[PDB]
Structure formats: structure tokens, C-alpha cells
Amino acid sequence: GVGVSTGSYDNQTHYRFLGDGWVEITALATRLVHLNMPKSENYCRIRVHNTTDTSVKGNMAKDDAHEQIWTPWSLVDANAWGVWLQPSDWQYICNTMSQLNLVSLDQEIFNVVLKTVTEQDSGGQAIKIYNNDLTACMMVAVDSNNILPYTPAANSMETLGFYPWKPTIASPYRYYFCVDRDLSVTYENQEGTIEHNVMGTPKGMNSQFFTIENTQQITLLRTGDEFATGTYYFDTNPVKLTHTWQTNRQLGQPPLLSTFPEADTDAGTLTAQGSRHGATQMEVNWVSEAIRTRPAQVGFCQPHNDFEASRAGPFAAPKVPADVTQGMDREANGSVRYSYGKQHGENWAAHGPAPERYTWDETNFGSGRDTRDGFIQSAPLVVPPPLNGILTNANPIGTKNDIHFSNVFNSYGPLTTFSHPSPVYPQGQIWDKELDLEHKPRLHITAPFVCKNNAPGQMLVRLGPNLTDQYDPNGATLSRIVTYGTFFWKGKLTMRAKLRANTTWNPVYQVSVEDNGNSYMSVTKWLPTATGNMQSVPLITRPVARNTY
Amino acid sequence: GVGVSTGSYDNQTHYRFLGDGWVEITALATRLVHLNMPKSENYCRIRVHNTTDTSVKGNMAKDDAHEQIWTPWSLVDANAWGVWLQPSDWQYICNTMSQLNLVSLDQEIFNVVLKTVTEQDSGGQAIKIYNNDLTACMMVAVDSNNILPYTPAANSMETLGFYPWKPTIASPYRYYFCVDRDLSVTYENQEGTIEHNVMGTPKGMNSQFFTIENTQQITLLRTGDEFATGTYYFDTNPVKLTHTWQTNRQLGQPPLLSTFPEADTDAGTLTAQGSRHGATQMEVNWVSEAIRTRPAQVGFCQPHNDFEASRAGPFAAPKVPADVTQGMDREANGSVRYSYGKQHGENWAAHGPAPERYTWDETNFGSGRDTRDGFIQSAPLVVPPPLNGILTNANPIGTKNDIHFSNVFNSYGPLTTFSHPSPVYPQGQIWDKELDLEHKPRLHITAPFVCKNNAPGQMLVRLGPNLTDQYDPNGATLSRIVTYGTFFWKGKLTMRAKLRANTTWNPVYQVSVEDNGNSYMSVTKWLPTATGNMQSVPLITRPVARNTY
Amino acid sequence: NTTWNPVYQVSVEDNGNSYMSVTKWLPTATGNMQSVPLITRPVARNTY
Amino acid sequence: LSTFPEADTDAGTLTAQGSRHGATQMEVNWVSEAIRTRPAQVGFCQPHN
Amino acid sequence: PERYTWDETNFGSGRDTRDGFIQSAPLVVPPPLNGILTNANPIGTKNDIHFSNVFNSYGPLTTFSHPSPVYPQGQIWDKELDLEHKPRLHITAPFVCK
Amino acid sequence: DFEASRAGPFAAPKVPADVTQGMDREANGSVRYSYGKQHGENWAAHGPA
Amino acid sequence: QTHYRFLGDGWVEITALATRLVHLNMPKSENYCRIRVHNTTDTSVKGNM
DNA sequence: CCACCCCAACA
DNA sequence: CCACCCCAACA
DNA sequence: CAAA
DNA sequence: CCACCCCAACA
DNA sequence: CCACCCCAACA
DNA sequence: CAAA
DNA sequence: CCACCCCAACA
DNA sequence: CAAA
């Protein structure tokens, strides 16, 4: 029974240089995991209604009231980048390869360890002895039939360790349940009251209570037991490791230069606007670099800081990423935002239960939109636009001062384009199911790859209940022995990508590691410390042009 | 699972007498090893800067400031002689065989034991109970891809026991990391200050941080698990178990004797120097035994006690071994020097944390160079050399008294030869990689054999982390159970050598063991004691001529 | 890619004054052109 | 390393030089990081100018 | 004209001439003065003329990297001196037809 | 030169090389021979020279 | 042009080309000359070696 | 899976 | 079941 | 040993 | 031994 | 009837 | 050239 | 003798 | 259209 192992340990990254710059990247990782005993061996329908940030008047974007359901089952997510790659690899990848895809994924578990603890030592100070239970279990449920919801733990930064030589932990599986809410708007102090702040009883219509021990099979794993899945093949679209910058003013034949400089420090000049040949969609007589007809609408003006509503009511409305103009609208061009803990970054030697993030500002420049240059004219596009014939960024709307029109605008015409949300080395996600909606989003912001068909089945792990001498279920609270366990986990993630060309003349930007300054990109940041702490800093993947038009 | 063994125990030395004095020596050894729990399960980049031997003025040859990196991984080295042979064997070998080589090497591990200790006994005096954990691991990583550095533990006298019936220990793996230094010279008291004694921040250029749990595979060994490597074939040059003595004055046709003695006590005499037939490379008219043109330059005059510099700055500059003339320049003819502890010699019954060595003085006589007879003449090689026409060993240089010219000299002309650094029974090394430099040393001083191609892969061993009931990695310090283990280790080392001839008339020197005196070579030195202690004394291997020219 | 730590490379920075800054390469109003000798070997090799 | 730092800003320390195990090509009794026997001679000192 | 002084990368190889250093017989660490020869110790009776200017440590225990290419300018290939014996390398070019 | 060892001295050879317009004849280690009749000499000379 | 080929086993093949247009004038002399240079203006100094 | 102080009563 | 800092001395 |  | 909320990407 | 300090560059 |  | 920023819509 |  007990004695021999069940698995190996591969946290290697294998490269294969095929024919025609068709590389095959096979990443592995064997993380050792610790899983304790669920507090409850029940299913609970728990609700949260923070009436301490909900009973204010301005605190709307602070609504955290949701009706959740807890499962004694502990999940296992590895849908992250940091778990599959190293700082180097990525560098070699993003820095060399053009595009990239996602192939297979083969998860495996082995060398299961199960131990018990007996709080002893009353005839002294206090000591907890640890011994094994070579008869114990560890229910493993792999829900591929994707019957249950899809909870990408990477969501709430609840994944698997990034440091392959550091024991990590799982994420207790919990899923959403139908309730119903109604919350009204209100500013700072406003007068009167809010009126109603109601939850929602069972909507015996949208109710959807599941049970792992009902829908998915369980493979009671002991000690000498090995659980392993099959090779899940992916059917997703590639991802381009290249960034653009071709705006609308940088697409087509530049104006004809009738005059050229005569020596550095003397630019050229075009010819009489209203005498210049070309087309335009404006009824004036003079083509400009702004008027002139182009192929499409680079990037679109999305209302920033919306805030929509429904049955759980609020909720900010995302953005599809886009640079943060020379004005750093950073909140419009919906640049994101992350907050991770040690087990996913942080100065692995910091203090204060204070998270840490790194606002991601896309590269897909020439795409972004500056909100500090809005601008809209009227009928006869009179250039020297009067005032009553324009609407700038300062012109109030709704009678609210700091409330502009760019906050409502929405320019998503059948003449719109834009780049896909690029990956994010550490933290960042990988793949993500797809909303089972008749019609669907062009993309998900939450991940560069979206399986087109079913998706990987989630892998749920639980300790098996270890009982004592007593147990009459007609017992309010039942006694169980303190049982916990180790198992290793290994992962196969396969990708296949192409090798970039070199079409320019000018070198191009890359990722490097500088001396040790203070610059974001400086070793020390990565290599350990006297003791042995370790950071991971999200890096750029896409450093390199792509001549859009 | 548990019950049956996994390996044997062979610390035998097998001989095979092939056809044509082609012997095959297959040495084995099964050392039992003890490996404790790493203090840290982290990777640390530790530095040392002894500013207590560095802030002096003369103490330069005491700089011990290096930026090291510690690995939770414990290494296993057997690249020694003492581990592969006995006092007898060697005697039989070095004493009989002419030359010798190095063939295969097959390492193996088995009968893995893993136990836990529970400090108990507060209801008394204090007792630590020991029990087993038949579910525990012991990560074994064999880095052959020689990706990581090459740390011949035999370097810092950190190898495997020599006494096959005495449990030994491994060596925690640590490797060098790029820093940068600058230290200035200074004598005894000198005036002023040193100026700067600086370390070196990350040279985000020479940085090279590795991770075993990233580059090399790990074979999670349990109790009933056996890990074994393949037979590594060697591609190195043979080694001659013969010593020379043919100087430059002992290569060619001796002068013609025109007069012979008439009875013991009356030597012969040659004929008028400046009337003697022969050649010379000196413009004089009289051939001497010193002037006369020979085939080459036996041995070369290397600057002794150099002391060069660079980025970690100092460092003595080696020497290729050469006798220690009748003047025992012992420091020039770079005779070495060892310092070992019990587990590699020492009066296995001594006291005081005081090491012990044995200055090795090569045999490759007629090669060495005496620094007490230097000598250099001028243009018209006037024999009765005036003073202002010579430069002896007493003639100052640089304005420093005890600072001579022999300290700078360097006679390594395309007419130089010399013997390879001979082995050193106990202690001494065996094989050693090779500097991946476009151009390479003719030899390594540090070992008689240097694999011409890749080299054996190092074998790294670690305990697997045994966890407790608690573990939130967002935990400053994590709790782990005191876990340690035994495993045996066995070794196959194969060599093939030739049987010496007997071309002289006069017997020749050998290795023997005298009665019990006080002489270096006297039994008692080897055989145990009342109790049972044991020495190993490095012996001579090469006792026997070889007519060089 | 055997290490863990990224490693140095050659890149082209914004336009400063640093040796490695575009403008240095791309032509000029007129059309002149420099060539600046660059580094080839940016990357370790664990000697021993 | 017989002594390890306890937190960034406190390097480790080796053990008594003339008590340290290892080899050397110098006739003294205390191995250093400069004395200690290595494989070869990295780079060479050429007469400049 | 215009140039660019090439400073190899083959670090850990280079040698600092501002830390020379040579001791005598019994390698007494606290080296007296008359028992050393530093970078400031004259030679030939010339002040700014040191011993590092004459030194030559090219023992059968020497290694070093090949002169690396030099993108622009720099050479490519170069014949080989028809000498019975030949240089280990040419500084003037990374590749030397054999 | 003049080096030493166990039979002690001995000049240290030279690999041949011209004798510059200054005829260093002893540096550029030009050699040197001395033969008798049965290998040259004015097969009709005198003096054991 | 500069053509790249990604073979099997990271064995790339780089084929570089270049077609430079060249201008070549008429040699001043259609003779062979043995010319010498002896700068006795940097040679007749004392330090200028 | 014990043969004449090793491999090897060899296979 | 150790080959030249990866897959892979590949099969 | 970088090709084969 | 993971395919589109079951058996069952069935065999 | 000369091969790498023996038989023996074996046959 | 020590294996083959 | 034009195919998806190279060789090469390869042959 | 990135595989096939």
C-alpha cells in the first residue's frame, strides 16, 4: 500500500524549435498543496449586506451585498500566467515570439499525504502531536461537464503559488445564487433618505442550487492513489505579441510635401488647405489631417465611470483597454488594476495586511482616446467655431459642473476597430469560458484567450470526513477528528507560437534588466534577498510595432 | 509498500587481469548518508564582507568577501580518491601499474529511511521520541545537463566519508553570484587610508539566478523507492603513474671522457672547454653543461606569490606543480596544500577545531626550479661576469629589498614542457569539468583528469517539506515538522590501466609500510586503535622513473 | 533560457541623450544617417 | 556559511581562516578566497603600452 | 574622424592594474614593505614606470574568451599567417579561415 | 638567462630569430657550432682548436 | 535583403545579401610604383616614436 | 543463492 | 536510468 | 560541439 | 484519464 | 629485418 | 598511445 | 511572374 | 492566418 511514490516533479519549461519558426512551448509545474478540513460539511446559503457602507449617501460604488453559497469543496485553479512561466521565459517569449496560442492542458495529482493531530500535553505546557492515517480519504471531483458555475479564482487573486518551491493552498469553492436588490442613487450629503435597501428572497425562478456530491463523480484518493486528467485540447484564437500605434492620422498617404527642409531645424510645408487635392466627409473646402476620410474609427469613446444597474443593481461597466493619452485618462481608457498578496507578488517580506497592485496601461496606443480634447462642431462646420456652435470638455451637461459629455459619449459605429486585451505576465489570467448567451461579446477583458467551445473542467478537492466513536446525526453539532493533508500537483500547459521577423531597420524596444537603480526594470527586484523573499512584477508583453495601416 | 529493501552494499574493489597487462579496476562503495532539514525553504542571496581582516593594511590575502547564493538543496559529491580506494589498493595500483585512466561511473541510492522527532517529556526531564513517516519524501535531482555551476565539494573538503563503515553527510549546494569589488594594496602600517572597500550591487548583466525546482527534474523518493543513474562514460586522457627527473643537464650525449678514474675515489675529466666539440646558443668559445643547446626548457620559472586582481579583485595566481629544489622553495614550485577533518583524515581522536594538512611536494623533480641560483648575464656573455653585468637573487627590484626579480620572472617559451599534476591518494580530487572558454588551460592543477566533453551531472538531494495543520503563506515564518532521513548510497567507478615493465637493473623505490617508528610510513598510522579511530595519510603515487630524454 | 532572472538586452529607448536612443539611427529632416557600434554578447554563460 | 543574516541588512560570516577546511598553494595556515586553489588563471596580465 | 572605444564584456577576465600585488617567500600576510611590490614601486629608476608594464602571466594555466565581433565597422574573416606555428587567435577578427 | 634546478644550471634556449641591424646575435638566440676535420675544418689545419 | 530560415532544432540559417553600386575612376598611373614614406617631421623629435 | 584471501567454481 | 546551461546523446 |  | 449544465466527444 | 622503456606494430 |  | 510585414502561397 |  504505502511506500512507493505516485508522481514526479516537473516545473520545467521545454522548448521545441520546429520548422518554420513554429515553436512549441510545453510548460510544467508541480506545486505542493495544503488543504485543511472544511469548517462545515454542510452547504450554506450565505448572504452579505454591508449596511455600513450601504447606509451613507455617496457610498454606492461600495455595494458588496450578494447572496452566496459555500461548498465544503476546495477548488484548484491554475489559470494564470505566473504559475506557468518565469520572468526569464516570458522575456524569451514576449521578447522574441510574435504571436502565441494555447494548446493542451494535462493536470495530475500524486503523493497524497494525510495526517491527524492530537492536541496533547496537559501534563506540561501544550503540544500537538502529528501522526498519519494511512486509511484516510481526499475526494477529488473534476467537473468538466461544466455543470457548475465557472469561478476563475484568478478573479479574487486566489490561485496557486508562483514560486514553485513554496507550498501554496487551494480556494474554497463558492458560487453565486439568485436574490434581487434595489438601491437608489445619492450624493455625498443629499437630503431626505434612501428609501429602500432590500435584499431578495428566493426567486423560485432563478434559483439554481447544485451539489458536487450529486452532479460530479468523486474519486476517493488514499495515499497510494493517483488521480490524473486527460489532455484537454483548446480551440481558441491566437494572441498577437505585437503592439500598434497607427491612429487615424497615421493611416494612408501623408500629405504631399512641396517644400522640404534645408537642414535639421526647418520642417516642410504642405499646400493651401482649400486648394489641396483629396477627399473629406465634411462639407467644407479644405482638406485637413483631421477632416480627411479614413478607413475606419481607431478606438472608440466609451463612457467612463458609468455606473449601470439591474436586479443586484450596480455595477461599473467595463472598458475595453486603450492607452491613457498624454493626459493619462487612466480611468477612461479603462486601464485596470490589480492587487495581489505575497503568494502572487508583494515584497515577500512586507507588513500590514495591505495589498499591492500595478495599474496596467495598455500599449495599443494610437487606439486610446484623450478626454482633454473632446470636440464637436455643428451644421455648417464653420472652422472658427463660435461658442454656441461647440461642445468641449468643459461644457456642463445635466446642470452638473464636473459632469461632462465625454462621460456619456459612445462612438462604437460599424466603423470601429481595436486590439484585443493583451496578456499580463504575472497575476493576469489565461483562459476563460464563455457566456452561454445567444449573442456574445467580441471579447472578454478578463482574459486574452476564450475557449470557443466547452472549457476545462474545474478541479475540486476535499478532505473526506474522518469520524470518531460517536455520531448520531440527530446531533446538532457532530464530532469529527482534526484531519488535514498534502498532495502535490503537476501541470502540463502546451502552447505553440511563431518566431518574429525583422522588417524594420531601427532596432526596437525590448525588455531588459538594468543594473540596480531604482528603475522598475532592475534585477534585485527579482533575485531573492539575504533571507529569501521574492517579488514578481508584472511585465510588458507586446513591446514591438505592427504597422496597423 | 514498506518491508523489502531496495539496494545492496558494495564497498569492494574488483580487479580483472585482461590480456596484455590491461587491467580493469572496478571500485564500489555504499556510503550511508544522513541528511537533515534545511533551515530555509527559500533561496537566499547572501553576501560576506569580513571588515575585520579587510580593514587592516596588510591583510589583503585575507579577502573573503563574496556574494553567494544558498540552495535548500543538499549536494552529494564523490569526486575523490579516498572514497574509491583503500590504502592497500592504491599501493597495489600506484606501486604496480604504470599509467591509469577513468572509465564509467554509476551512482545509486536505496533503502531510504525517513523519521520524525517529537520533543516530548515535560512531565519529566526531557526526551525526544523518534518514529517513522512512511509517507514522507526526499527530492532527488540529478543535474547532468550541467546547467547549474560546478561545485566540486572536494574543494572545501566537503565530500563523502572515506571510512565505508562510518555514516557521513552531504554538502549543502551553494553557488557563486555576480557582485563587483575594488580593494587597494597596502603594507603593514602604511599611512593614510585604504580609500574604498566596496561590494557590488546587482550587475543586471552578469546576474545568473538558477532554481533546481525549475531547471532539473525531481524524483520524489519515498521509502520503497530506488533512484539510480546510468553508466556515465568518460572521455578523458590517461594519467602516468611514473615520475621523471631528466633536467636539461640530463638530456643528450654526456661529455666525452678522455680520462677515467683508476679506482673508487678519482673522477674523470673532460677536455678544454673552448676546445671541446659541440654546439651552443651563446656567442662564446667553450661549450659547457649549462650553455650547451638542448631540446627544450624543462619546467618554467613562474612568479611566486603573485597576487593578481580584477572585479572581486584578488587572487593568488596558481602554479603548475614542480619539485621544491634542494632549497625547498616550497612556495614557488607551487607545492600545495591541504587541510582536512576527521571525516577525511585527522587522528580520528584529536581535539581542538584545528584542521590538519600535508604539503604535497611533487616528484616531477628535474622539472622544478631553484630560486636560490637565479642568474642572468648580459650581451657579450663574459663568463667572469662583473657585477653591473648580472642580476642575481639578491639584486633588489622596485626599490624593495626582499623583493627580487624571480618574483616577476616568467619563462614560458614555446620551448617549454612539464608533467601533469599527479593525483593525491586521500583527499586529492579526481575529475573536474572544464572552463567553457573558447581557449582553455593545458591542464587543471585542481585534478589529474578533466573530462573533455560534458561532465557528470551533479546529484542534489533534499528533504521534501513535511507540513503541519497550519500554513497561510501569507505567514512570515511557516511551521514545519522536524523531519530528517537515512539513505544509503552506492558507487561504481571504473578504471582501466596497464601493468609496468621492468627495464632497469636496479630495483626501484616503492611504497612500503615499515615497522612502527615514527616514520611517516609505519603501520599503526593506518590500523585502528584501542577504541577505534583511523587516519588516512596521503601517499605518493608515481614512485618510479621514466627516462624523460 | 536557463536562469530565472530576465537578462540584459539590447533595446532602443525613447530619445534622450542615451547612447541607445532611436533618433541616433532613423534619418533626419534632410537625410543623414549614423551607425553606432552596438554590443553583441549581452548574456551570461556560467564559465565555471 | 555558518551564520546567515536574520533580515535584509546583516550578511553572514564564515569560520576561522586558519581553521577553515580546504586547499591552497600557499604555505600558510588559513584558506582565503584569494589563496584558495582554483582550476586555472582567468585572463592574463599583459604588458601594456 | 570619429570612433568608439570598444570595451569587451568578457569581464571576470580583465585585470585591474590598480591592485597589483606580489609577496615574498614566507607569504607573511601582514606583508612588510621590503617584502612587497605594489603598483607604486618604481622599476628601472623611472617613477611612473611600474612593474605591471612588464609583467606577463601567461602560464599553461591560462584561459580567456575570443575577441567578440563589433557590429558596424568591425571586421569579419581574416586569412591566417602562413607561420609553422600560429596565434591562438587574431584580435583583428572573430573568424579566421583555417 | 640562466636558470637552475637539481644539476642546477643551465642557460635557457631560444627559438631562433634574426639578429636585427644591431646584431643582438646572442638574443635572437643565433647559435653556434664547433666541428673537427671529420665534419669540416680546413682538413689541413693544426692546433687542437 | 536578409533572409531567415528557421530549421529544426534552433538551427537558423541567415542568408544576407547586398547589392552596392560602385564608382571607379581612372588610375592616375598605369604604372607600378614602389613608393616610400619617411615622415621626418614626426620622426625627428625625440619622443615621437 | 558458499568453493580454495578480489572480480569468478567465473559466465 | 547522466552527455556539452531546455525539450533530446533526442527517439 | 555545433553540426549533421 | 476533461469537451459544450446527465448517462456519453458516448462506445 | 626498427615503432611509442619487455615479450609484440605482436602473429 | 593506451586502447581496441 | 503579387498572397497575409523575411526566405516561401514556399518547392 | 497561424497552422498544418
Side-chain angles (χ1 to χ4, degrees), chain A residues 14-17:
Chain A
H14 283 119
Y15 278 109
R16 229 205 226 177
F17 286 119

Side-chain angles (χ1 to χ4, degrees), chain A residues 248 276-297 377-382 411 413-415:
Chain A
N248 259 274
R276 238 147 122 190
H277 301 98
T280 299
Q281 211 167 59
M282 237 133 227
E283 191 163 48
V284 184
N285 310 71
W286 49 274
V287 190
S288 296
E289 277 310 86
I291 303 180
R292 182 179 178 181
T293 60
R294 318 296 214 188
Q297 218 177 82
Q377 333 218 329
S378 306
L381 163 68
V382 307
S411 187
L415 299 179

Side-chain angles (χ1 to χ4, degrees), chain A residues 15 87-99 241-242 498-501 508-513 521 539-544, chain C residues 1 6-11:
Chain A
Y15 278 109
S88 179
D89 269 3
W90 187 255
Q91 178 170 6
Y92 184 172
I93 293 175
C94 302
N95 249 298
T96 321
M97 319 246 156
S98 48
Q99 96 209 52
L241 295 175
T242 297
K498 182 91 174 172
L499 299 181
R500 73 174 197 89
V508 0
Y509 186 10
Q510 328 278 94
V511 182
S512 224
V513 180
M521 318 256 5
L539 307 176
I540 296 175
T541 286
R542 286 230 184 162
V544 202
Chain C
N1 186 175
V7 0
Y8 186 10
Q9 328 278 94
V10 182
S11 224

Side-chain angles (χ1 to χ4, degrees), chain A residues 69 101 109 153 186 244 277 288 293 310 317 321 330 344 356 358 432:
Chain A
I69 284 205
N101 214 176
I109 302 172
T186 57
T244 42
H277 301 98
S288 296
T293 60
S310 224
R330 249 208 197 168
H344 315 267
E356 173 161 280
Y358 182 82
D432 177 271

Side-chain angles (χ1 to χ4, degrees), chain B residues 183 187 310 315 331 400-401 410, chain E residues 14-15 19 25 33-34 56:
Chain B
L183 175 65
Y187 52 91
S310 224
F315 60 81
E331 281 202 3
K400 297 264 169 147
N401 296 294
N410 172 184
Chain E
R15 301 286 180 163
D19 290 12
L33 282 206
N34 286 299
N56 172 184

